[PDB]
Design a protein around this nucleic acid. Structure first.
Ligand SMILES: CN[C@@H]1[C@@H](O)[C@@H](O[C@@H]2[C@@H](O)[C@H](O[C@H]3O[C@H]([C@@H](C)O)[C@@H](O)[C@H](O)[C@H]3N)[C@@H](N)C[C@H]2N)OC[C@]1(C)O
Ligand SMILES: CN[C@@H]1[C@@H](O)[C@@H](O[C@@H]2[C@@H](O)[C@H](O[C@H]3O[C@H]([C@@H](C)O)[C@@H](O)[C@H](O)[C@H]3N)[C@@H](N)C[C@H]2N)OC[C@]1(C)O
Ligand SMILES: CN[C@@H]1[C@@H](O)[C@@H](O[C@@H]2[C@@H](O)[C@H](O[C@H]3O[C@H]([C@@H](C)O)[C@@H](O)[C@H](O)[C@H]3N)[C@@H](N)C[C@H]2N)OC[C@]1(C)O
Ligand SMILES: [Zn+2]
Ligand SMILES: [Zn+2]
Lengths: 50, 86, 112, 249
RNA sequence: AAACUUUCAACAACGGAUCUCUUGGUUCUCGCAUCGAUGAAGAACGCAGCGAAAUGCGAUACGUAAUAUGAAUUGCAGAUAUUCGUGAAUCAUCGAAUCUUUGAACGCACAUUGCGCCCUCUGGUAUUCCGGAGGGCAUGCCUGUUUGAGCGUCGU
RNA sequence: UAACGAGAUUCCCACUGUCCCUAUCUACUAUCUAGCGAAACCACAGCCAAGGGAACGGGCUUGGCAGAAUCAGCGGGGAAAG
RNA sequence: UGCUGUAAAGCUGGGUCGAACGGCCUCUAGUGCAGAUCUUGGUGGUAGUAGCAAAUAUUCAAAUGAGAACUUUGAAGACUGAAGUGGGGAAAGGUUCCAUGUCAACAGCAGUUGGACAUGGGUUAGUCGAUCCUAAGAGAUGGGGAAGCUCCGUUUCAACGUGCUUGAUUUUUCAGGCCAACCAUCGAAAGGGAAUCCGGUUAAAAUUCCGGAACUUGGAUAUGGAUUCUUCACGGCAACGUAACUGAAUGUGGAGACGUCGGCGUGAGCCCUGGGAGGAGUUAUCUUUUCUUCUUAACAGCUUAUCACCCUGGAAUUGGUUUAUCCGGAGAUGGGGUCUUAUGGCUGGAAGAGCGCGGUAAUUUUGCCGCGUCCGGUGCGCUUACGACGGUCCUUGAAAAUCCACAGGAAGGAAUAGUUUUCAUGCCAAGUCGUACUCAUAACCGCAGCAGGUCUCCAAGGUUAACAGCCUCUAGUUGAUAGAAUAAUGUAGAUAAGGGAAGUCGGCAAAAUAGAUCCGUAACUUCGGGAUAAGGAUUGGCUCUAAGGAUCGGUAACGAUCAACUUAGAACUGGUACGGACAAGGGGAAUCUGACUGUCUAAUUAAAACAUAGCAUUG
RNA sequence: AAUAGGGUGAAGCCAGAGGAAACUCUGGUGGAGGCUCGUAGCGGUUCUGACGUGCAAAUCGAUCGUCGAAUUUGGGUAUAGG
RNA sequence: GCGAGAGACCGAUAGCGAACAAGUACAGUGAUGGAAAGAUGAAAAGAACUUUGAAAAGAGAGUGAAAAAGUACGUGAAAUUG
């Protein structure tokens, strides 16, 4: 809701931060294994559970 | 109407986030975490749930202080500073 | 006709969420939020409203001068004129009767 | 089987009394020096309705003997008491309606209400609307008074126990029928959760000793021994007799 | 007879079996005794020139000091960074520090970034009102200090 | 037992496609096309008559017979499925 | 490709391939699969099959683009129809918001579009909330249980203040005097509660930003005024009035602070309406015409009221008086005053704003100028607030924080002098967290963009009893794969000669009735009902007539001015139609059964079951 | 916090008529009720309608019960597996 | 727990659930429940350039011992398919 607590809004900001694709320069490093971010979250598919 | 129609009336949370374990197991009306037992002094655990002990036990976090006890023990719990070799 | 919305987050028609529909100089029809009505100050004996006392919400009595809160008479802002009159006569008549009982009783003992 | 409704009442969860709207406990003044040796005068300020109670209550103001302060008292109003009346309480109080006197100071046949069982407990007997206690006789050597209780029982009480002269007001409520389930609903809405009442024979055998059967019937005697245990005491507990009362008693 | 269906072979698919390995697992043995109010284990949130995670760390934040060592780091960029040197990189070593919000969690409270009180300094014409900085105020129990209570009680 | 009843029942008036006895009309399907595209189920399979047989066979024995590929319907059988 | 063995199997030719492996003698085992409705993974037939059919409906052209049934713009045709498909919120979500780019996957067709994907941007408060208070309730503490995790107790068998005020002292010490009944703490984004409005502004925020105008609380403090030689003000018969106009402990009172229904009155917003000043429309003909603009916040001053109250006076020939019959020697009627400011009026705010027209500079940021923005009417209208009343209960309809007042008379106060910030003006400050967006036939929950579920505010014209149904304005949508046909059988909806329940377990289903006015209405009955019993007649349009009022002015029984729709009657008239769509009871005679209203088997039983008032018994 | 528009017309009140009296009758007014027709709401009778690999693990259409109180409903709070 | 050495053990459906950003992703109000997933090549040398196409891609070319190794990447069985 619009009326939200500080603790909730703090949790929401972190969830936005982690919802980003892989930076491209990561894939160029020596012996790199990660090709995409496997922990993406979409607001309508999987809920945050807060 | 006990299935789909009744499932539409779920908008009041029984549990919220726990300050101790951060898990969303703090029961609102009982003021108690169903996971760690907060605000009881002792952490909740049971011998009939060994896998629950795995999820949250020593070594599952940072061990920011126990990490270095073994190294400090090896050196005899030194006090002082290293002395430069001349 | 122009329709209005609440200006606060409260969406329910509660005692503290009453509105008034007013027309602005911009030509618009807006809702304004109406404060709760005040009650009269009432007499401490008969419960009737006291004349000459401003009808205000109780926190607002700290903002007005003393003349709006009282009447120039004994028990001014507390008791009405008729109960004050009744208190005065009752005080006089009973205390006079106490002297009468006092004097009468000494007569009972002097002669017996 | 299952815990029966009888047994569930004692845990006091949904069966506690509904007390939000009640106007205070009805008690006499504490026995103090003034009432032990003389009398004290108070004034009736209000006569009010107490939800859940058929009898009106009187709010009565007394001076504090020992410091500059008013004391409000919650009495059970006797019939004829009015607002502005002076109420006298003590050993020397006159024999008038509403005055609080020890039972030793009342002659034979005095009608009294809100009577103490032990001296200084502030009233236990004859407290409901239309009820009262009759003073039967005195035993001055033993300092005991014999009284007649509303149920018909006779009881010996200390002569220092107090009572209030007159009949509890509001008498005659039960003369008018309720006529409606809704009136009963409104009645118990401010008393406790004891209405409506499902019959034991309408239940299944888990629910009640009377439940079950291919007809509704009790099946064994409904008179239950006083020595039966919880879950068995449904029916007529320790009945000396049953059936329609004929003749006198 | 074609089409269609069926059988086989070849190549191409579909799919991930087989084979070969393996910084993992499993079991046995050997040696050692070291968590916490000096705030643990755990939790939340942050921290990089360019990072989501994992790893590390705590506003001194992928780390500060010290000791050792001796030329890197590296995906790209980059020095007011370095090379016969107090000197590149280094959880190599590690004894000095930093260590947010919490947590047995300790001024009270906590579904709140809510509310006090005390001391020192400091801003606003200020013993009170408003602001800032630093330092404090939990419970049970022990030893001691000080101030007391009771015709419990001695003496004068 | 007045009043009340989405309670059970009988008769009557009104009413009518419930019926005699069926007909005709409309929209959406079904149908055909472009695109999209499941599931149940599946030993192997699939034309009949008789016989014998676990006493009611798709297969076995004896007969009738028997010609590609198919579309819309259908509810006899598959002692159909669940 | 062949060879060997009865066989389990063994060997070999060719192809593929890239790092280890085999024979023999022995050892050892987690050692051989077709099945276990076996386990895990993978893949078929079915099959290009079932299907993608609720929610009225789309069309032409242009632009863009490789590509357009589906994007954008324009033009139409429609719908929701204010109880919305409109405008907001609470819960829940959490960036879905906005701009730019973009189409692999997703949007069960498509895609240039998107709640998708990518990169950025965006949420501004002393006044709106939270925060504080207490509610049902939760819960520490001296304690009492329990082996103990812990249980019990909170009006808690307790030596329970981290007290308060002074005369000041600074010596950061003192000294006294008041008291300690109650009070740990948590518990409401709908209860209680200090204070803000209007105009403008963004791509996306606004009662938060800008402009202007206010308010509250806390503090400081100066000036003026007021007060004092009769020390702590005057006036009024009074209700009470005022710019102020000492008042400690302690006590007390008020506000906060309260159900529900009924009609009545007033106000506001909306609806309707006349004149005038602009603009738009229609124009074969006409409409002094059809549509549209003409507005005024918080706050400040003066004023304004039902009720209530005061003074006078003294009442039967009883009077006054409400729609509702209550009031008067406990003082009516009459006359004169006082008070609450709900609400309205005038002025300031404030025309400088907003709105409507007209002009002009210009590739323009942003405009700049001129004129106007006026005067009335109406009501069983609609909604809403308030008021004075009346009814109702074996039902009588929160608490606390907080603020004020009074009683009291401590203390301190005069003369060439003390006050008080409850009189005016002036000065300073107001922290923390929330604030975007959705609120649903796509932003929540139902595995999903699911015909389900999910609390609430605002509410136009016509018809009408009506917020029903039907049509329309503002606003919003035009979303739901599409094309071509129109067999059978369906689903949804219609009609049918003559008969009229013969159908069927059974009139299931359907039909018939239906509004309003007038007439007429049985048995039975608890006398309240039954009852719309049953059953008849009427109803359009047009042109008229009559009755029912308000305010002014002196047998005024009148004249003048103004005004709302109800009712009744008549003439004329038509393919006998007319509650013309919409909307809208079938009825009667009995039996069984439960008195009645009410309640339950969420998802096969709503009943005669349960409950109930009444009655009785028991402790 | 929420609940169109009608019908019926209880006490109380005003006025009139009749009667020798006791008493009786009439016209208004008023606006009662777990009263009634009927929206929203709440419920869930029947078609044993649709659907029955659904729009849906209970829905959809029509027909229905009730609709000012034992009414409907949000939030807070209490009761926990013999 | 900390530090070591081993095995007639298992060899990616095995061995711990986890050889991998594994108690992770995800589910449930909650207590709890809980996966899948190792291998191009010695070296990215990860295909410059030309051409067809809106693009994805294709065809030439190129690198490499091998493209019968093209980040759908060691070998590449069977069902099933052209
Ligand atoms: C024999 N010893 C007794 C001791 O048992 C105790 O007596 C208590 C007494 O204090 C209690 O009474 C007390 O506590 C109650 C509380 C329980 O509600 C209070 O209400 C009451 O005022 C108080 N006096 C009483 N109710 C029971 C006695 N056994 O204290 C008194 C005593 C003499 O020491
Ligand atoms: C009359 N005897 C019964 C006896 O039958 C038994 O009852 C069990 C009951 O205990 C079981 O229930 C048990 O397990 C369930 C669940 C986890 O399965 C729990 O919810 C429950 O707490 C636990 N008691 C229930 N599932 C079956 C009954 N017959 O338990 C004892 C008893 C109550 O006395
Ligand atoms: C490209 N897809 C990724 C990819 O990382 C994939 O890898 C497999 C890889 O595991 C296979 O390689 C395999 O090699 C052997 C053998 C059976 O082939 C397996 O046993 C082993 O598990 C596995 N490494 C490889 N042959 C194909 C890739 N797509 O595994 C995960 C994934 C998401 O599907
Ligand atoms: Zn926890
Ligand atoms: Zn009074």
């Amino acid at each position: 809701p619009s009326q939200k607590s500080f603790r909730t809004k703090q949790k929401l900001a972190k969830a936005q931060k982690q919802n980003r694709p892989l930076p491209q320069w990561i894939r160029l490093r020596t012996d790199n294994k990660i090709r995409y971010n496997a922990k993406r979250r979409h607001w309508r598919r999987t809920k945050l559970g807060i | 109407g006990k299935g789909t129609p009744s499932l539409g009336k779920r908008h009041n949370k029984s549990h919220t986030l726990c300050n101790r374990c951060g898990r969303r197991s703090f029961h609102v009306q009982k003021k108690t975490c169903s996971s760690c037992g907060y605000p009881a002094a002792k952490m909740r655990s049971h011998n009939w749930a060994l896998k629950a002990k795995r999820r949250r036990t020593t070594g599952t976090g940072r061990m920011a202080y126990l990490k270095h006890v073994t190294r400090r023990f090896k050196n005899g719990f030194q006090t002082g500073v290293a002395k430069a070799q001349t | 006709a122009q329709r209005v919305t609440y200006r606060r987050r409260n969406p329910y028609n509660t005692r503290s969420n009453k509105i008034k529909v007013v027309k602005t100089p911009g030509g618009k029809l807006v809702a304004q939020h109406v404060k709760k009505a005040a009650s009269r100050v009432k007499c401490g004996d008969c419960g009737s409203a006291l004349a000459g006392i401003s009808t205000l919400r109780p926190r607002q009595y700290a903002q007005v001068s003393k003349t709006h809160k009282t009447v120039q008479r004994a028990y001014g802002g507390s008791r009405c004129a008729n109960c004050v009159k009744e208190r005065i006569v009752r005080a006089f008549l009973i205390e006079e009767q106490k002297i009468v009982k006092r004097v009468l009783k000494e007569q009972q003992d002097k002669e017996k | 089987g299952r815990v029966i409704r009888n047994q569930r009442k004692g845990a006091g969860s949904i069966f506690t009394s509904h007390t939000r709207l009640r106007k205070g406990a009805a008690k006499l003044r504490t026995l103090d020096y003034a009432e032990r040796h003389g009398y004290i005068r108070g004034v009736v300020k209000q006569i009010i309705h107490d939800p859940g109670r058929g009898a009106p209550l009187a709010k009565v103001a007394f001076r504090d003997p020992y410091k500059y302060k008013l004391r409000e008292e919650t009495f059970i109003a006797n019939e004829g008491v009015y607002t502005g009346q002076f109420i006298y309480a003590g050993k020397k109080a006159s024999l008038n309606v509403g005055n609080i006197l020890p039972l030793g100071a009342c002659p034979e046949g005095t009608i009294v209400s809100n009577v103490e069982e032990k001296v200084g407990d502030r009233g236990a007997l004859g407290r409901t609307s239309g009820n009262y206690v009759i003073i039967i006789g005195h035993n001055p050597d033993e300092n005991k008074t014999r009284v007649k209780l509303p149920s018909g029982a006779k009881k010996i009480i200390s002569s220092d126990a107090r009572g209030v002269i007159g009949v509890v007001a509001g008498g005659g409520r039960i003369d008018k029928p309720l006529l409606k389930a809704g009136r009963a609903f409104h009645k118990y809405k401010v008393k406790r959760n004891s209405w409506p009442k499902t019959r034991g024979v309408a239940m299944n055998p888990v629910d009640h000793p009377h439940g079950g059967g291919n007809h509704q019937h009790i099946g064994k005697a409904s008179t239950i021994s006083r020595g039966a245990v919880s879950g068995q005491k449904a029916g007529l507990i320790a009945a000396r007799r049953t059936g329609l009362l004929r003749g006198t008693q």
